[PDB]
Design a protein around this ligand. Sequence first.
Ligand SMILES: CC(=O)N[C@@H]1[C@@H](O)[C@H](O)[C@@H](CO)O[C@@H]1O
Length: 142
Amino acid sequence: MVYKITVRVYQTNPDAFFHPVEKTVWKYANGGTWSITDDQHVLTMGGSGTSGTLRFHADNGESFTATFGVHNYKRWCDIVTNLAADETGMVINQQYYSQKNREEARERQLSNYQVKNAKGRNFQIVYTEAEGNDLHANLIIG
Ligand SMILES: CC(=O)N[C@@H]1[C@@H](O)[C@H](O)[C@@H](CO)O[C@@H]1O
């Protein structure tokens, strides 16, 4: 069965403005699509076992990735900050299926995750619909 993750982005801090610069879809489970409906980022996936990554950039230089997926039928998420110039969204997304620390994050099947970058800015994902096939998450930028 298809899994869908609908993402709403909340920017709370006027000291920066982030915008999406990359949207990737991993190749497992017949892939999927990132679309937009009413300013929400919708990731539609062919079944359980894949994910997609949104990369955001602020004009002040800050950036991060937010990755959303389903692993053994349960949602997961992760945020990577302090990105190198050669860590594009497609690099990060693939690492969830090759790099140990990323694979472990996926395997945790988190309904919520937060992390701060080197400047102390908080980034959080919270699934407000956290079970079943029609999943909804807030991405909250501090
Ligand atoms: C500050 C930062 O980006 N830390 C992350 C963490 O958020 C993420 O869970 C991880 C595994 O993918 O790699 C990095 O340790």
